[PDB]
From Swiss-Prot, chain C:
UniProt family annotation: Belongs to the herpesviridae major capsid protein family.
Name of the protein in question: Major capsid protein
Subunit-level organization: Homomultimer. Makes the hexons and eleven out of twelve pentons. Interacts with triplex proteins 1/TRX1 and 2/TRX2; adjacent capsomers are linked together in groups of three by triplexes, heterotrimeric complexes composed of one molecule of TRX1 and two molecules of TRX2. Interacts with scaffold protein; this interaction allows efficient MCP transport to the host nucleus. Interacts with capsid vertex component 2/CVC2. Interacts with the small capsomere-interacting protein/SCP.
Lineage of producing organism: Viruses, Duplodnaviria, Heunggongvirae, Peploviricota, Herviviricetes
Organism: Epstein-Barr virus (strain B95-8)
Function as written in the Swiss-Prot or TrEMBL entry: Self-assembles to form an icosahedral capsid with a T=16 symmetry, about 200 nm in diameter, and consisting of 150 hexons and 12 pentons (total of 162 capsomers). Hexons form the edges and faces of the capsid and are each composed of six MCP molecules. In contrast, one penton is found at each of the 12 vertices. Eleven of the pentons are MCP pentamers, while the last vertex is occupied by the portal complex.
Full-protein interval shown: 51 to 198 of 1381
Localisation: Virion; Host nucleus
Curated annotation (Swiss-Prot), chain E:
Highest taxon of source: Viruses
The gene coding this protein: TRX2
Keyword DNA-binding: no
Lineage: Viruses, Duplodnaviria, Heunggongvirae, Peploviricota, Herviviricetes
MF terms (GO), sorted A to Z: structural molecule activity
Record function comment: Structural component of the T=16 icosahedral capsid. The capsid is composed of pentamers and hexamers of major capsid protein/MCP, which are linked together by heterotrimers called triplexes. These triplexes are formed by a single molecule of triplex protein 1/TRX1 and two copies of triplex protein 2/TRX2. Additionally, TRX1 is required for efficient transport of TRX2 to the nucleus, which is the site of capsid assembly.
Keyword Glycosyltransferase in annotation: no
Annotated protein name in UniProt: Triplex capsid protein 2
Subunit structure: Interacts with TRX1 and major capisd protein/MCP.
Length: 46, 81, 148, 49, 289, 49, 49
């Protein structure tokens, strides 16, 4: 909802930013996010 | 062999380890099986009648009615708040 | 007038391991794996506790052996990984142009992030089933302050 | 047993003196709660532990 | 495509329970989830059919309609393995059910709540506190009359009832248990049938009454044996009208749609379309209809 | 990541959150003054002490 | 900006009525009035001074 999904080279940081994420996206801390479960969790077509 | 990250405490003669897998389950957003539920049953009566040889054990409280004939009809309990 | 992309980031999934955590202190990992091959899930022990040789003429202090049978708990741990088919269509198609080489490297990276997802899911499911075994045979302390 | 009473007055006297409170006043009773959890009660500022 | 569920026990299955489950291999079992590894507490029909409450079969029919079906192939210690039933595959289902209905005609089968009793298909686990009940698999000509006996016992509780209580077959008669109260959803189905009937009674034709009158007074068929040579008066006062074709044609179109809706209402439970049944091997190659 | 479970539950597949964060813009401005008599001397050249 | 303020709402009732089975839970408050016919007309509150 305001997010693009391109096959970017994603820099691999080491932060613990998984903690309280699936509950934080449900309440709406993030203004715009895309949840990709299953086949959508892919480095998309160029 | 390799170092294992585990805080070891000494309880008498045994040196046990203390490991928390809370970080392992918070990266799943899955509940940690050590935050369990505990349901105890609470029971309380309401409307009982104390037998007619009657007594008090407190010289502080003074109700304004007849002490011989008084019946509980409700039971004031407390919440969690 | 431009639209800056101020950086782009992903998280590193930490590799948990059952033999790296301290939950494997309370477990011995036998390299035998014949109790999976064995048909019945029992193993019979001929244990033998000692005894105190009593002297008064109450009863003869016969020796104590116990033929105890310990049934083994076999648990099945299963995850799934829905993987797209047009990733397979690039996996089999040999790339020649650099754009399809980048797309094929992306398809391999999507596949290798699902096998890694499966291995990382079976090293968390292993710790989960081991921890649920140690919580199923764990009687509470208000019982074993006295029963023990 | 939960914290039951028969009037508000025995509730108000339970917080005033935790030790010397009367469990029975002539016809009314108060049942002090025991439990595995020692839930802490606050009525205004008079706390019991 | 791996279609195989490994339902795992928590506790150890005793030897007599292993023999009782090995006696039932190939039978239909309904599952809670469609996934590869499940638990026992949720396998079977026991979560909707419990000992503590009344046997209500209409919610069991909708449970068998909704949830998936699986056949039992392998039973061992601590685990019993099932095979799901998907459209497009042919499955072998053996007749191991205690009121024995012989599938000689190779008719389409039907999966039933255990209306004949629990305790013959109750098969009990003393490992873990659960009761696995196996649904009755039987042809749809028996299934329609069992469902009509279920629906008719509740309306004939008020006003010979042993004929409605038991079943009719070619070889034998079996006793199926009826409750004194059907339940909420059985009463809902009886309520929907009552509203359908009280609406459709005015949309009945008029011409067939003249047929049944002239046929009673003229020529007795074998099908005309129910009236015991008697006609009521409601037939007469709806035969004080003259016959046309237009209102009857519109009434027969709405009668077609209402009989299709009643076909939707009566068709409860899964049905299996059998092909090439082997009576000597006692198994049947079936798929989901 | 996800835990593989042995009890029959609806299993979450490989999830991936794509959350973006848009920048903010803060524009600040004060306002200073300068006399024109302090500029007509600044833009000249003097020959006097 | 780190000298902020608060908005706490303070609510208090004025002139309620205690119900008819009247009690008390203290000695040493003796009023020269009729305890059955008692009614609050005010509510004495405390200033910040």
């Amino acid at each position: 909802e305001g997010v693009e999904n391109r096959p970017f080279p994603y820099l691999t940081v080491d932060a613990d930013l998984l903690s309280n994420l699936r509950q934080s996206a449900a309440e709406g801390l993030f203004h715009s996010f895309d949840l990709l479960v299953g086949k959508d969790a892919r480095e998309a077509g160029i | 062999r390799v170092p294992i990250s585990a805080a070891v405490i000494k309880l008498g003669n045994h040196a046990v380890a203390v490991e928390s897998l809370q970080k392992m389950y918070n990266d799943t957003q899955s509940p940690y099986p050590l935050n369990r539920r505990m349901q105890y049953s609470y029971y309380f009566p309401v409307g009982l009648f104390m037998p007619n040889p009657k007594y008090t054990t407190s010289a502080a409280i003074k109700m304004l009615d007849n002490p011989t004939q008084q019946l509980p009809v409700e039971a004031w309990i407390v919440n969690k708040n | 007038k431009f639209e800056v992309l101020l950086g782009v980031y992903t998280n590193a999934i930490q590799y948990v391991r059952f033999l790296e955590t301290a939950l494997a202190v309370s477990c011995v990992n036998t390299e035998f794996k014949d109790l999976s091959r064995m048909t019945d899930g029992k193993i019979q022990f001929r244990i033998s506790v000692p005894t105190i040789a009593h002297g008064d003429g109450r009863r003869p202090s016969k020796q104590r052996t116990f033929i105890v049978v310990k049934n083994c708990h076999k648990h099945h741990i299963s995850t799934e990984m829905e993987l797209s088919m047009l990733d397979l269509e690039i996996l089999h198609s040999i790339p020649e142009t650099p754009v399809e080489y980048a797309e094929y490297v992306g398809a391999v990276k999507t596949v290798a992030s699902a096998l890694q997802f499966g291995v990382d899911a079976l090293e968390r499911g292993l710790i989960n089933t081991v921890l649920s075994v140690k919580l199923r045979h764990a009687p509470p302390m208000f019982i074993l302050q006295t029963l023990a | 047993p939960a914290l039951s009473a028969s009037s508000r007055a025995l509730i108000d006297e339970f917080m005033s003196v935790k030790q010397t409170h009367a469990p029975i006043h002539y016809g009314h009773y108060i049942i002090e709660e025991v439990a595995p959890v020692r839930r802490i009660l606050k009525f205004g500022n008079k706390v019991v532990f | 495509m791996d279609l195989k569920v490994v339902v795992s026990l928590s506790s150890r299955l005793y030897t007599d329970e292993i023999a009782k489950m090995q006696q039932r291999i190939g039978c239909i079992l309904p599952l809670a989830s469609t996934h590869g590894t499940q638990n026992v507490q949720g396998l079977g029909l026991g979560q909707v059919y419990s000992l503590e409450t009344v046997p209500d079969y209409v919610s069991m029919y909708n449970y068998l309609s909704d949830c998936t079906l699986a056949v039992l192939d392998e039973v061992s210690v601590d685990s019993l393995i099932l095979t799901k039933i998907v459209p497009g595959q042919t499955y072998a289902i053996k007749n191991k059910y205690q009121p024995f209905f012989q599938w000689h005609g190779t008719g389409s089968l039907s999966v039933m709540p255990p209306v004949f009793g629990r305790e013959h298909a109750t098969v009990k686990l003393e490992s873990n506190d659960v009761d696995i009940v196996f649904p009755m698999v039987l042809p749809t000509p028996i299934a329609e009359e069992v469902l009509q006996k279920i629906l008719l016992f509740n309306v004939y509780s008020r006003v010979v009832h042993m004929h409605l209580g038991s079943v009719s077959y070619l070889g034998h008669h079996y006793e199926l248990a009826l409750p004194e109260v059907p339940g909420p959803l059985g009463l809902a189905l009886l309520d929907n049938l009552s509203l359908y009937f009280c609406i459709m009674v005015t949309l009945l034709p008029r011409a067939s009454m003249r047929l049944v009158r002239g046929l009673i007074r003229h020529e007795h068929h074998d099908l005309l044996n129910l009236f015991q040579e008697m006609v009521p008066d409601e037939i007469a006062r709806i035969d004080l009208d003259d016959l046309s074709v237009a209102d009857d044609l519109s009434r027969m179109r709405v009668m077609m749609t209402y009989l299709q809706s009643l076909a939707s209402l009566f068709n409860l439970g899964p049905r299996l379309a059998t092909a090439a049944y082997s009576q000597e091997t006692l198994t049947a190659t079936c798929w989901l209809r």
